[PDB]
Amino acid sequence: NTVTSDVDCSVSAAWGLYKFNQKSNFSAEFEMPESVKAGTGFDALIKIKDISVSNDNLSGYKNAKLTKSSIRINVGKNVKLDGNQPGLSLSNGVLSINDHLKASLEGNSLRISAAPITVRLQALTEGTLTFIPEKTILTNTASVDGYTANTTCTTNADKPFATVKVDPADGLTITAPESASIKQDVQITATVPEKLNEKMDGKVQFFVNHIAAGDPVPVTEDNKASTSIIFDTSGSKTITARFIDAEGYNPAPDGETIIPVVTELDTKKPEDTDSYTGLINGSATSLLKPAKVMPGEKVSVSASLLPNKAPIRVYEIGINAPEDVKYIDGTGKTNYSSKLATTGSVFSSPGSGYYDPEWKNESKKPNESYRGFHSDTSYSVVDTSPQTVSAEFEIPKTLAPGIYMFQMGVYKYSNSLKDLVSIPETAFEIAGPDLPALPERKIKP
């Protein structure tokens, strides 16, 4: 990263009575971090390489020293000097390195040299620092044989010495579950960088879907802030933390996060020793990436039971859609050979040797969309291959906005287990209205 660029020098000496041109090369090594954070001090080491100038009248001179000098570098407007640093000045994106050049006379030649200069900088905002040489890269004043010579060297180098990526400074974070159900406490924690909260007297105003949620929470001694939110309805909820300082300015960006919220999550019972998966429109979704579906739409769902162990006894499987979502007739297939024993929560025998789930007795029953299937061959499952049921459903055009999930109805084991299992891989979401705009941040002037 030693960047070379040739220069054109004008000399005025003896009060302008003796002007001449001179060509030369300016060459410098800029060692800086490849990358930094906005706001973090860093060093720039500048090695300037020696220059020879070979005018023939130099052999004729008896003494020389520089009395002034300047290296002019275009460092842009995204940087400042970190600490008063003598010799160095910064004005209008011009870093001016002053009085650092030494000039030793050497017969026929003039050797201009410099001890490496260290410059501590810090960038202001996220972006890039680009170091360009200035057109007038170099001026100096020389005292030769009792005369004063003024020099101005211009260059045409477009080529940056170094580039530095400015990554942003640390920002607010927010910690929420994962996922949540309605009617339950959800803890939310914001954290504020040490650096925004230096004076240790700030607050964090939370928002839920862009509405203010409670009074601003005062930040703790450990730069944290917490609230507790109880959700009313399902949906991808946007949580926003806004930081406020001693005199309510919002100097930092807001932190945002999203919590998927469900009506309920019906996990497999503890004694259910298997596990489950599914698909919706041929894909395993997640309640964090729910399928985007509009009301009025027909979807296809698959639900699989993945045995932990074989053989297990497995009697009835089926897909229990959400309330109002209607089953499409004759679409329910199994992985295997089967007859349909159960419509709704009503069982009726499709032959002798078929066991009744008695969903009637259970506290949670399947709804009108549920279709339950028994194997005609055997109730034993020979291996650990997925036991899959799949069908197509219709979403009514009036189904409410929120996050929805399909369930698997299952009745199994010698020790008779009956359960409805929410399969997050089948999650879809009916979009609500666009959030309202957030109140504007109050930036300091």
From TrEMBL:
For whether the record's keyword set contains Oxidoreductase, the answer is no
Q: Name one GO biological process term.
A: carbohydrate metabolic process
Q: Where is the composition biased (Basic and acidic residues)?
A: 357-372
Per the record, residues carrying N6-methyllysine are 224, 397
Q: Which cysteines are joined by disulfide bonds?
A: 9-153
Which keywords does this Swiss-Prot/TrEMBL entry list? Membrane, Signal, Transmembrane, Transmembrane helix
* Region Disordered: start-end pairs: 352-372
Its source organism is Corynebacterium diphtheriae (strain ATCC 700971 / NCTC 13129 / Biotype gravis)
UniProt-recorded name of the protein: Membrane anchored protein
Q: Does the keyword Transmembrane apply?
A: yes
Q: Which parts of the sequence belong to the DIP2116-like N-terminal domain?
A: 6-165
